[PDB]
Amino acid sequence: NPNYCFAGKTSSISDLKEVPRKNITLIRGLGHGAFGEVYEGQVPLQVAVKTLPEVCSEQDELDFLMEALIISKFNHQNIVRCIGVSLQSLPRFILLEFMAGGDLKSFLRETRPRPSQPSSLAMLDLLHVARDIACGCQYLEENHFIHRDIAARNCLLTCPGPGRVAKIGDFGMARDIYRGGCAMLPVKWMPPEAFMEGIFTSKTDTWSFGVLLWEIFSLGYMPYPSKSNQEVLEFVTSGGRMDPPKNCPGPVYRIMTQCWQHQPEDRPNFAIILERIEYCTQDPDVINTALPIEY
Ligand SMILES: C[C@H]1Oc2cc(cnc2N)-c2c(nn(C)c2C#N)CN(C)C(=O)c2ccc(F)cc21
């Protein structure tokens, strides 16, 4: 059975916390992917249940196992907790911290300020989400883990309302690479050396975080609007970068453009990104900036 190494320790399937199946109740579907369903569950501990299809390959099984190992080994407030697993019964379960706010992309789109609720969100809310995820990314960086797929679709929120905390909630790409196709690669989140050379470092995630920042401050738009993957690949390789999201303060856009420096050595590490995000939250002219209310 497969092993996983993180920090200075090596772990095994036998290390995962197995929860007896009889203690687990499924409540409702949470919007299931195209491979594996996700449910709200109870163990009365509230959890999210990620399932493995009983109709799957040998590699599917091992991928599912690896994901559990990866998430169970992290210990940070901005990475979702793994409650445990139920692997000895079928279909197999991974039990995660329940994040009632859902994924970040849907949240941003669903919670955009509107004529009905014109103050659903403010600039400081967006800066706090970005700070939360940057804090998770800094943890990964200082522990030498490369996520490879930092994007709003892979972040979750503890709740819809003001006290929300954002966390990285999916590690499927890092799992795939740890051991597929061109049209499935998230090229719109990738730096040139990543999609040209297949070189990944912590500065890979820095670039992707810049794109996440744009997703956040655009309130859930798809990156490079109207551009296809190949067009973006050629655009970015030639020095092209996204314009500021609508109403985006200059100090915030400046963080994005630094994350997108062509040379990875010219891009900030996450300690520096965090310092700059914090300076934005202190600037009244940033946080007093009104977000666009779409009619
Ligand atoms: C594995 C899954 O985890 C959770 C999903 C949810 C809550 N808590 C956890 N742990 C969730 C979602 N939507 N809604 C309405 C809820 C609720 N309540 C998002 N979703 C369907 C996903 O598949 C998904 C997407 C991204 C990601 F990073 C992890 C996940």
Side-chain angles (χ1 to χ4, degrees):
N1 37 287
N3 274 72
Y4 171 63
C5 309
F6 173 69
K9 179 184 167 297
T10 298
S11 63
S12 189
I13 314 72
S14 299
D15 291 301
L16 296 165
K17 179 77 176 183
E18 174 80 6
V19 175
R21 175 62 54 113
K22 53 178 161 60
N23 290 159
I24 307 179
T25 307
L26 274 27
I27 291 293
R28 57 171 52 91
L30 291 183
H32 322 120
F35 188 80
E37 297 174 308
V38 181
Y39 297 92
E40 176 187 349
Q42 291 209 160
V43 172
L45 202 63
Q46 195 175 33
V47 305
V49 185
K50 181 169 187 56
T51 73
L52 177 65
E54 290 201 65
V55 296
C56 64
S57 70
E58 282 278 354
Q59 185 63 224
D60 289 331
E61 289 274 10
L62 302 175
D63 280 341
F64 192 77
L65 168 56
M66 194 58 43
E67 190 165 66
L69 279 47
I70 292 177
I71 298 178
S72 291
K73 282 336 289 179
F74 294 133
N75 170 31
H76 194 274
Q77 151 86 316
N78 296 116
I79 300 178
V80 292
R81 311 296 184 160
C82 180
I83 304 319
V85 299
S86 177
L87 304 178
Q88 295 176 176
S89 289
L90 297 160
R92 310 197 199 284
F93 289 166
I94 291 177
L95 314 172
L96 305 170
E97 179 180 2
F98 183 71
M99 301 286 80
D103 80 88
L104 173 59
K105 183 176 171 68
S106 299
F107 169 89
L108 292 164
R109 296 178 75 98
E110 289 183 4
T111 204
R112 287 179 180 154
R114 210 62 188 260
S116 53
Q117 349 91 200
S119 179
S120 56
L121 232 40
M123 206 62 86
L124 186 69
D125 295 290
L126 304 186
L127 285 168
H128 280 170
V129 171
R131 198 247 280 109
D132 290 351
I133 297 303
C135 195
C137 286
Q138 184 188 216
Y139 171 82
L140 296 181
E141 176 190 319
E142 63 188 19
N143 286 99
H144 313 111
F145 185 100
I146 305 168
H147 187 275
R148 293 176 193 245
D149 197 9
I150 296 297
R153 68 187 163 270
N154 292 323
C155 299
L156 297 164
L157 297 153
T158 53
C159 65
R164 71 191 71 84
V165 180
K167 316 191 176 190
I168 304 176
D170 178 284
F171 290 85
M173 180 73 61
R175 175 275 312 278
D176 289 354
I177 303 299
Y178 192 92
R179 289 287 68 182
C182 167
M184 291 179 65
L185 282 180
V187 309
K188 285 171 192 161
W189 286 263
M190 291 162 77
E193 77 275 7
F195 63 70
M196 287 182 70
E197 293 285 346
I199 291 175
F200 293 83
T201 66
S202 55
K203 294 298 180 75
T204 300
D205 288 340
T206 293
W207 177 290
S208 303
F209 180 85
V211 180
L212 166 62
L213 271 185
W214 191 96
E215 287 186 283
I216 291 171
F217 284 83
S218 68
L219 285 305
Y221 271 78
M222 174 70 72
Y224 307 88
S226 85
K227 277 187 174 69
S228 67
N229 279 352
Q230 181 60 33
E231 292 170 344
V232 172
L233 191 162
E234 295 167 17
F235 183 68
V236 166
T237 292
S238 300
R241 305 290 188 261
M242 288 190 277
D243 290 336
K246 175 166 19 173
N247 281 13
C248 186
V252 176
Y253 184 58
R254 196 112 57 262
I255 295 176
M256 297 179 205
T257 59
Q258 292 167 330
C259 289
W260 302 328
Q261 286 296 309
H262 182 91
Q263 300 272 83
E265 59 260 45
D266 294 318
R267 318 204 278 249
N269 61 27
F270 280 99
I272 298 306
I273 290 172
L274 268 172
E275 288 183 6
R276 304 205 195 289
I277 291 174
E278 291 170 335
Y279 201 65
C280 289
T281 69
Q282 292 175 286
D283 188 344
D285 284 334
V286 170
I287 61 175
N288 286 327
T289 297
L291 283 172
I293 304 177
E294 76 162 12
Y295 194 90

